[PDB]
Amino acid sequence: DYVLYKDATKPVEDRVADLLGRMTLAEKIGQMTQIERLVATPDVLRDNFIGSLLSGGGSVPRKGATAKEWQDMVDGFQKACMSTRLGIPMIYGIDAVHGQNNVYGATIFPHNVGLGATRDPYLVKRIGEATALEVRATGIQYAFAPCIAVCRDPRWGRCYESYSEDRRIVQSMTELIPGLQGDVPKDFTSGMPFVAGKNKVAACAKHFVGDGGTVDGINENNTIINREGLMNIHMPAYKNAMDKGVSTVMISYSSWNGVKMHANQDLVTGYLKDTLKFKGFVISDWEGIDRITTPAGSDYSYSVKASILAGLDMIMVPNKYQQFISILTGHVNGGVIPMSRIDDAVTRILRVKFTMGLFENPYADPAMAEQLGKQEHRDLAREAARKSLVLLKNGKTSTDAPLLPLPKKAPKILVAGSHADNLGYQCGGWTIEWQGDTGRTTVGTTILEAVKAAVDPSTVVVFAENPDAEFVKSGGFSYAIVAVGEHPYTETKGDNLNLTIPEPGLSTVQAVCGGVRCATVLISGRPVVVQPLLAASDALVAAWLPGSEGQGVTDALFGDFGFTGRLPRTWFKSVDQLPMNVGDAHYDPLFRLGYGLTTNAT
Numbered sequence: 001d002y003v004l005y006k007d008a009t010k011p012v013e014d015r016v017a018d019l020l021g022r023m024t025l026a027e028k029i030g031q032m033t034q035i036e037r038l039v040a041t042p043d044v045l046r047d048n049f050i051g052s053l054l055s056g057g058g059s060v061p062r063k064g065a066t067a068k069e070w071q072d073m074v075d076g077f078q079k080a081c082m083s084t085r086l087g088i089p090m091i092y093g094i095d096a097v098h099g100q101n102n103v104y105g106a107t108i109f110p111h112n113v114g115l116g117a118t119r120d121p122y123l124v125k126r127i128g129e130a131t132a133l134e135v136r137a138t139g140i141q142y143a144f145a146p147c148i149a150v151c152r153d154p155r156w157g158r159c160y161e162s163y164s165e166d167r168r169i170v171q172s173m174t175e176l177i178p179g180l181q182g183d184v185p186k187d188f189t190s191g192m193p194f195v196a197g198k199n200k201v202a203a204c205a206k207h208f209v210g211d212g213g214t215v216d217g218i219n220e221n222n223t224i225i226n227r228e229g230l231m232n233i234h235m236p237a238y239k240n241a242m243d244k245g246v247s248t249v250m251i252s253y254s255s256w257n258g259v260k261m262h263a264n265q266d267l268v269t270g271y272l273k274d275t276l277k278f279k280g281f282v283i284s285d286w287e288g289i290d291r292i293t294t295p296a297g298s299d300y301s302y303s304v305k306a307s308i309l310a311g312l313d314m315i316m317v318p319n320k321y322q323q324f325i326s327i328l329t330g331h332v333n334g335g336v337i338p339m340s341r342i343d344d345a346v347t348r349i350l351r352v353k354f355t356m357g358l359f360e361n362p363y364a365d366p367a368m369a370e371q372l373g374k375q376e377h378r379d380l381a382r383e384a385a386r387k388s389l390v391l392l393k394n395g396k397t398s399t400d401a402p403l404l405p406l407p408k409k410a411p412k413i414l415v416a417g418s419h420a421d422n423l424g425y426q427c428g429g430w431t432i433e434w435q436g437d438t439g440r441t442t443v444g445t446t447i448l449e450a451v452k453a454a455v456d457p458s459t460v461v462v463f464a465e466n467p468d469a470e471f472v473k474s475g476g477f478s479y480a481i482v483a484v485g486e487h488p489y490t491e492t493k494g495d496n497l498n499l500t501i502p503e504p505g506l507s508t509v510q511a512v513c514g515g516v517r518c519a520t521v522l523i524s525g526r527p528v529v530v531q532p533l534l535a536a537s538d539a540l541v542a543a544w545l546p547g548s549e550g551q552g553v554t555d556a557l558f559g560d561f562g563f564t565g566r567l568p569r570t571w572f573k574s575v576d577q578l579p580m581n582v583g584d585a586h587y588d589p590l591f592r593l594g595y596g597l598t599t600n601a602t
């Protein structure tokens with residue numbers, strides 16, 4: 001007879017109830033299971049009824065894979081899932097957090113701390129739109145973004161995934177979500193999941209909650225703050241996410257006052273689901289339930305009980321699915337987890353799959369392949385990079401001639417420093433590899449290439465990565481651009497207690513700037529100890545991690561556009577002040593939240 005869940009004209013809630021009432025226990029637990037593509041096979045997916053797959057950082061079908069290799073990979077997994085008895089399509093997730101950043105040739109946008117400096121929610125909406133197209137070009141339907149952490153200490157290794165220490169800036173940057181997912185209807189109820197169709201992706205607000213609040217910015221550690229602090233600093237951007245229809249929420253590894261978020265029923269069920277009325281699904285982080293215990297994974301059976309009873313809907317296992325499925329079936333068969341907690345989880349996963357069009361369009365669209373790296377996207381990324389630059393200094397004294405903007409026509413100019421010609425340093429973490437990498441890892445324009453592309457044909461451009469002082473003073477340069485800063489890092493590898501840049505950084509600047517007037521371009525994921533760089537430089541520009549389109553840097557240096565960017569964070573004087581945030585008692589910054597100098601276009 002007639003199968004209502006297969007009928008595309010029926011309300012979402014009727015299709016969900018009709019399918020759910022057919023599923024066995026194996027089929028329901030399979031929907032809650034997300035696994036990494038490395039352990040997936042057609043039989044695994046079909047015999048375990050798997051609901052979701054992901055790529056972790058750097059988990060790609062081949063190095064250099066075109067958009068169509070990605071599509072064929074995702075479709076081949078999808079053909080296995082559509083061949084199960086109920087034919088429930090999988091959803092494939094990926095970290096597309098500054099563009100579709102795992103994929104060769106994708107447009108790489110500025111990381112989020114630089115987007116905070118723009119103060120333009122409309123630009124960030126546009127980046128979400130272009131991001132969704134490049135994720136759908138590879139066949140993927142779900143992005144793990146945005147991170148709406150409110151980083152409160154720049155020593156954290158994920159502070160550059162945070163838009164700001166100020167939760168008001170983070171709130172206004174939740175406009176990424178309707179870029180990624182599409183604008184919600186006039187009809188719309190806060191906390192419903194929404195995706196507009198096959199040119200959009202499901203999004204993910206992460207990581208709930210207080211991930212940027214941890215002690216000493218230690219990654220994954222303990223956020224010590226009282227309920228009012230939680231609610232007035234770390235929480236509010238979640239409620240803006242509910243109003244824009246964010247489809248999924250990801251739970252943090254971090255604790256709140258000693259309680260693991262992955263075992264917190266009060267916050268996850270009591271607040272997120274029952275007070276904000278979130279109706280999408282809640283997904284764990286990568287081996288988040290394992291880390292509930294110390295050592296991690298020492299009582300997996302407890303990890304499964306505590307996290308499913310806290311309210312988590314989908315578990316990113318993501319390798320050992322056999323142990324997860326066995327233990328979870330055991331607890332349900334023993335009465336330890338009731339059936340109604342399972343049916344709630346599966347209801348939520350199915351709600352998002354039906355709402356986004358997945359049952360009607362389970363397969364990739366080959367015509368979307370040419371969205372990847374599209375030029376109009378690279379122009380948008382160029383505009384973002386340019387608006388994220390903060391001019392901190394433009395002249396060594398208040399009576400000096402302003403160095404920027406620089407003339408395009410000069411007899412001879414020097415480009416120096418370890419970041420002047422290194423695409424991987426300019427993009428930072430979460431770019432091609434999980435940790436990012438060095439060198440020419442993808443398509444884009446370095447600073448040196450941007451300089452060659454901008455100057456008059458008669459200007460001679462010399463490059464030296466680390467020139468000595470005598471080379472600079474005898475070379476006859478009119479000016480130098482020197483680019484230095486942090487190396488790429490992600491997560492705990494970026495936790496950093498000293499906040500000073502690797503050498504050579506300071507000594508290249510000192511050599512270059514001692515011989516010729518210099519503009520210093522600092523690439524970093526956060527504020528770093530800056531005083532010595534400031535003292536040597538005529539001009540100093542915080543460029544953050546501007547991504548693949550380095551002509552956004554030279555657009556402002558050479559005066560096609562003015563500088564407009566403003567600090568999205570406090571710049572400290574020393575690491576012994578930290579944490580120090582707008583509002584604190586000991587507030588004594590080198591540069592306040594909100595500072596930046598401007599220029600006008602020539």
Ligand SMILES: *[C@@H]1O[C@H](CO)[C@@H](O[C@@H]2O[C@H](CO)[C@@H](O[C@@H]3O[C@H](CO[C@H]4O[C@H](CO)[C@@H](O)[C@H](O)[C@@H]4O[C@@H]4O[C@H](CO)[C@@H](O)[C@H](O)[C@H]4NC(C)=O)[C@@H](O)[C@H](O)[C@@H]3O)[C@H](O)[C@H]2NC(C)=O)[C@H](O[C@@H]2O[C@@H](C)[C@@H](O)[C@@H](O)[C@@H]2O)[C@H]1NC(C)=O
Nearest residue numbers: 438487488489493494495496497498499500501502503504
């Ligand atoms: C302030 O705190 C941080 C603590 O995190 C500290 O930096 C960390 O230092 C660790 C060692 O003590 C280091 O681990 C070692 O890494 C070695 C290889 O490191 C290279 O590759 C990694 C991975 O890609 C990069 O992140 C590194 O930055 C490094 O990169 C090379 O760096 C040199 C120097 O500039 C450059 O010329 C190369 O071209 C460049 N190559 C690449 C690929 O980029 C391992 O082999 C070893 O076994 C250790 O595990 C961490 O990498 C590093 N963290 C980061 C994110 O940088 C920092 O330490 C200072 O800086 C580092 C780079 C090193 O030169 C130290 O001697 C120095 O003290 C610390 N600062 C102070 C003042 O204490």
Ligand SMILES: *[C@@H]1O[C@H](CO)[C@@H](O)[C@H](O)[C@H]1NC(C)=O
Nearest residue numbers: 218220221222223254255258
């Ligand atoms: C925080 O870090 C320390 C190691 O520095 C660890 O012993 C402690 O258990 C961590 N706390 C949490 C909640 O992870």
